[PDB]
Amino acid sequence: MELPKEMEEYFEMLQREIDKAYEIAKKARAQGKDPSLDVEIPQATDMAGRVESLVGPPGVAKRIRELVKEYGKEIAALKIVDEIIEGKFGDLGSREKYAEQAVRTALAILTEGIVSAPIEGIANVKIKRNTWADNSEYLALYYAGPIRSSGGTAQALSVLVGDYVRRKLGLDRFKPSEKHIERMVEEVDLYHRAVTRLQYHPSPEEVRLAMRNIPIEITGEATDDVEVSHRDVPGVETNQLRGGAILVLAEGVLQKAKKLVKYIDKMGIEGWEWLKEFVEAKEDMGFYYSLYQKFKEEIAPSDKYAKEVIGGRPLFSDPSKPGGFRLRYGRSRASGFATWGINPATMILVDEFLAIGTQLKTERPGKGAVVTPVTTIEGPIVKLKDGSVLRVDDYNLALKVREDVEEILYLGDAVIAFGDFVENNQTLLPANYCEEWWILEFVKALKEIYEVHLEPFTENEEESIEEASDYLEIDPEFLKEMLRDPLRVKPPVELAIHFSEVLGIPLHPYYTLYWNSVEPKDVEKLWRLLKNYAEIEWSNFRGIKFAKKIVISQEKLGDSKRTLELLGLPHTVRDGNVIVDYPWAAALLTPLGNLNWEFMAKPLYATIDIINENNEIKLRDRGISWIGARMGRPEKAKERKMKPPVQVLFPIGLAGGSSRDIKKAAEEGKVAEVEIAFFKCPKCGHVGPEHLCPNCGTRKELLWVCPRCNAEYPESQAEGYNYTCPKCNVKLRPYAKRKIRPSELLNRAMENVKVYGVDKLKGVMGMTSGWKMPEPLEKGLLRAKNDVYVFKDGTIRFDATDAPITHFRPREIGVSVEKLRELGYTHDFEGKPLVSEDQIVELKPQDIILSKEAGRYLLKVAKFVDDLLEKFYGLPRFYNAEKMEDLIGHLVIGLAPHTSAGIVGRIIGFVDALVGYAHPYFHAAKRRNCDGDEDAVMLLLDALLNFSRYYLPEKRGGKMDAPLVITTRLDPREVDSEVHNMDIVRYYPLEFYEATYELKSPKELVGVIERVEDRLGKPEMYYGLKFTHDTDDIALGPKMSLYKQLGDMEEKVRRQLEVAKRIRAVDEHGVAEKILNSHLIPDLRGNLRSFTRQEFRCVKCNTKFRRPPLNGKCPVCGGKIVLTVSKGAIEKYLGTAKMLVTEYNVKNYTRQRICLTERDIDSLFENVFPPNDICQRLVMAR
């Protein structure tokens, strides 16, 4: 590729920094104090290198690179499989080895080398024979637990690759008996009932159809301990349930059948007709009256998100109900991938249950979303406690009037991108009327009438502005500012009316009330009331008559005041009168013709239709489309600790206590019998767990023990003997059960690193790795001194929620222009030089914005690294950081919990919110989207120094979530498919808006709106992306959610129901029953059932007894015996349930169940412990 000058320089600068880190990492490791003599994280620059360095075989990178450009990466996998079978890459051995290597390599190529499915998901590949049917050979694939988190798309491709390999090796099909099919049908349903709710639950007929045709077996080892009815099935070695295989069958081939069909068609695989057949079989009146009916028929409300309600997680809007979330089409600076954008005022008025980064269970576009503040869009309309109505579009106003709010008539707006609609295949909803539509109509009208060409959102030529201003008789500066920023700059009402009369465009959306939210009869009554009992003050503007003030008495108005509230018309109540102020009197009286023509209700017509029939100024619908949502999974930004906190990976056993404190064991001078590996010095013969000899100063060799005769062999002899004991002819091991003295080791380490003042130092009960090599204790001492924690591999990690960002301002992240110029930034997004902190700058692919908590933790980690380099290795310091602002320009590694490949990033700033901001390409490179996912960041030098493959767990899944290979360049072509649907246009055109009323599928509009996919291959995919909606600040709003300040369940339920009561579009009575049926009755009944079948425990020991001891004491300890399920567990939720039953109007079934539960709890404990109430009234009425 031929990139511009900037991108190549940026990548070269990143490479120079990486090389600078690697040089120190290499110098430090060569001293011999670590498990290896070289850095254990290789770097790769493309998919081919990652595939070669993850699954092999050696020498495959060049072939992949050659074949990809020729065929296109789908035929390349097949060609690589063919070449591996033929033996071009060496002689592997038996046919099973060839099959395993080919399957792993092909799946890695198709998956792009990031997901750990080829490494851990697939366990074995074996050849088996159809003994019962024909004695013919077939191919079998075994799956492990890690396959359950590898994604749906990776599961089906494995089946496809297995089928291709078995076809290429000249094998036969898998022919199942009826017993196999019946067992699979039972197993799927049993798994769904017992252990986990499958996202897609297949019908038994579909399961049978799948089992009858797949040419390869789908089996594995038992994961859960649940027995099955069908037992001793030939060819299946476990009577227990298998999880990975059934999740593959349910979610890969069935759920993602269409993608598999597309891959089959593109690749050319034959024999997959049944899947294609299954896929194809699977799939006199007013204007607005008809539009509403057709919308209701074609698009139906969805209530899947509101099935479950959890206490403390409120519900904000009912499914497709006016007064909820308005739908606005667009993408903000910090949203678009899967992220919504809402006004910060909405967050405050819901009692701060929503904070930046909080997940939402959404109805229409997708299942989940994340919130991010947008200031340009509108906010809630509220009713005060004295009857006044206000519009809140500011943070300060919401902060000021929160305590006086009585009802929330409208929640606000939501900004959802077109790319999400394309991704989820959601039919377009009718668009509401907004400013960007109005400005397009404005410029089109100017072009048609006066032949003057103008463009919104850009800088137009001066002469055109002057000519248009002369024609329209307005100030040219105002016209320029309105065209440049139509969202923030709005004309007064008199200019809007003049524009509507002269140009012929509709009324401005700002001054249009929710006219279709009220029936025509209410408007008919309001018309007579306003004509008879109202005093109005008039005004003139260029021959146009508009109202200025309306005063009407409250007693005469009567119940028509609710019509004004439903119309969203601000007004005040004073001295028994209702007063309508300046801008809104015209908004109310102008669409009605200033009372010149009478308003009469007629059948099969709406309010806007009647208005448009006999009025000069036309209107458009403002609230046609609504969306509901619910809260789940608050935002997260915190450091990572293993379940018991661990500061060093050193085994201690039970000699340290529950906290596993090495220092405490050293003080008491105990002897611990742990299972650990030792080393032997070649010259003096010292034996110890350290690597360097404490006396000579020379590197030691590992000792191998024989499990039977207990003989020690150094590394050289063990290599010579082929790791077999000559006497016993058994396999040797690197570890043995040995006894150590913690006091001497700790004292020697303390003398070594000159650290003495440490109070606690926590290790592990037992090592998991096969080598069982311990970490040096000096590292633990330094970690304890600097108060940092260690993971399984040996690194320190920080976990946070991820949100997207594409453009930023220097003032938001607290960085001067000089530092940005030192970092390489020179221009803004419009092409002008960077001179001010208020400009908008495009974000480079691998630059990230951290949070304050992340900076606070990473400062400690940097101090730890510097201390380690200065004392342990005797090398100059690297970071030299005194404050978190000194980490700007340094490198990190991003990693996802379900992958085994990392990407390098660079820090450029900090924010106050609890999120992690990065380019969408950065998140796509970790195979994640921004709908509530959590990723990890770690410092590069710390990972290079401390990471070792020897520390990893032996069992499957230990290589998952580990930096086995990192990537130094970012290529949008090989990150993820979802990001290709994201839209990058500055503003949507008129064709989109007019096509919304026809209810089109988004695939018909792909050619109109530019997307990322159209730029792939060209040098333009790295720069030039744009956004629709601006935002003043990306960290404005509440930081922490209210769910974290509530401890008791009763307080949670009370706050939840208060929020439900305040919102107009939520039925609190319906919410009251959902809590009882989803969170309270199940727990009460489960605890009541489990009380009578519990176990008993001793306090000193931890022995479990299935029945109480007769003497009342522990048989061995003699200590006290205590319950497992106590009375407090049963009755913890009873008062809240009683309150819900007595206040809100619930069904009779629930009332009787709760009353019976009370009676049952009371009756069970009668022998042990010898007025206007809901239960008494219920039992007295009948």
């Binding site: 009541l1088 009342g1112 009779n1148 039992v1179």
Partner: protein, 447 residues
């Protein structure tokens, strides 16, 4: 779990069934006395957990004492020594130990137990060649048993016999009755369900009123003076998730009112005994004292009804009738292989020869905290009645008759999911003089 809109149902308010003038009842005096009732005992009189643990300990100690007293009645049992006193005696002297059963393990040469008494815990080994090896092969945990053998200083009690508290092999024959009296046993009505048989129950009610086709049935009906119901009179609410859609009368008050309206057509000279069950509005754990009066009032006001506990013993003309709902049959089936449903007589034999209605703790039968155990069969009865299995069977073991009343509910989906095929609308007829079943009625043709 979603509850839909309300519905309109019926409560059987307009059912009247009269008496045939052809059948003239025979004048027989009534001799019914409730020998045992849970609400007759008075229980003797601070962290809650400590008191709960003490209550459970007292329960198990009381069970041990009662079953030890039952065991000692066997003449062949002699020279019983405490487990904590095992070291005093020599290693070649025969001794007998009595205690509960903690764990049973089957080895390649015999059986190994862990037997616990109030003084200690010992490990026992039963050789395979022992005659009473199959009886030890079927012993459920938490049952009081006895062992007879020598003790080795190595710490293993080598036994050669295994005893259980059984029914004695000889019992005196009761005196005859001047007149002949019959009784009828039914259970599991489940009023308020969709699968409840209505036409079958109405035909049953018309059989008690003298509408019969045969002369022998005319003879039998004129001599019926007792009717007994054991558990599951109503379907309840909230038993399992997904029950509202399976209910016709989804309210507890109207369920009991409907049961009262149906039962009012029972003839006047017949006396009814009704007891609680699993689904009924009563105590969540057994033993259950009675129904909640404020909920089940309509069946309290019947002028020929007596509410009894679970379990209870009824003496009819000098013959003892043990009546329990019978949830302990399920625990026997799970443990011992070869005993399945559709033949519930054999699990009943096991329960009887262990002389405890629900021995195992922590299984699938809930046991309530009580200072004293009331589930021990203290006196050998003449007839035992249970339910909960929905399959009819009747066996005789050493002079006692064990009868399992059927159900009035057709096959539900949960049963066909676990493969249980019930036998609906079958009614045993028993003779008081002999405590034996003389006839089985079949109303299953109608519904």
């Amino acid at each position: 779990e979603e509850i839909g809109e309300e519905k309109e149902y019926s409560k059987y308010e307009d059912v009247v069934i009269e008496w045939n003038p052809s059948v003239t009842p025979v004048q027989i005096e009534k001799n019914y006395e409730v020998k045992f009732d849970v609400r007759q005992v008075k229980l003797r009189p601070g962290k809650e957990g400590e008191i709960i643990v003490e209550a459970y300990a007292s329960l198990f100690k009381s069970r041990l004492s009662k079953l030890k007293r039952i065991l000692r009645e066997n003449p062949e049992i002699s020279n019983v020594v405490d487990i904590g006193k095992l070291n005093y005696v020599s290693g070649d002297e025969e001794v007998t130990i009595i205690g509960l059963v903690n764990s049973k393990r089957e080895t390649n040469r015999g059986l190994i137990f862990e037997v616990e008494d109030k003084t200690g815990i010992v490990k026992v080994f039963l050789p395979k060649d022992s005659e009473d090896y199959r009886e030890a092969f079927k012993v459920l945990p938490d049952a009081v048993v006895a062992f007879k053998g020598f003790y080795s200083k190595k710490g293993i009690f080598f036994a050669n016999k295994f005893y259980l508290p059984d029914v004695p092999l000889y019992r005196k024959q009761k005196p005859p009755l001047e007149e002949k009296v019959y009784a009828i046993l039914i259970s599991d009505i489940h009023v308020g369900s969709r699968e409840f048989c209505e036409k079958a129950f109405l035909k049953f009610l018309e059989w008690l009123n003298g509408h019969v086709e045969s002369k022998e049935e005319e003879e039998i009906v004129s001599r019926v003076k007792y009717l007994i119901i054991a558990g599951d009179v109503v379907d309840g609410i909230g038993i399992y998730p997904g029950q509202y859609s399976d209910l016709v009368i989804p309210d507890i008050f109207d369920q009991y009112e409907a049961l009262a309206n149906l039962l009012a057509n029972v003839p006047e000279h017949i006396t009814m005994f009704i007891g609680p069950g699993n689904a009924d509005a009563a105590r969540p754990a057994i033993p259950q004292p009675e129904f909640y009066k404020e909920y089940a009032k309509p069946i309290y006001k019947l002028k020929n009804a007596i509410i009894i506990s679970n379990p209870a013993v009824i003496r009819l003309h000098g013959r003892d009738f043990l009546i329990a709902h019978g949830r302990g049959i399920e625990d026997v089936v799970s443990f011992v292989p070869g005993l399945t449903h559709h033949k519930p007589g054999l699990p009943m034999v096991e329960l009887l020869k262990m002389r405890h209605l629900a021995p195992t703790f922590g299984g699938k039968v809930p046991i309530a905290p009580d200072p004293e155990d009331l589930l021990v069969i203290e006196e050998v009865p003449d007839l035992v009645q249970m339910g909960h299995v929905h399959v009819y069977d009747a066996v005789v073991y050493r002079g006692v008759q064990l009868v399992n009343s059927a159900t009035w509910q057709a096959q539900t989906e949960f049963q066909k999911m676990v493969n249980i095929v019930p036998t609906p609308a079958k009614v045993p007829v028993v003779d008081v003089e002999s405590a034996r079943v003389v006839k089985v009625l079949d109303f299953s043709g109608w519904c």
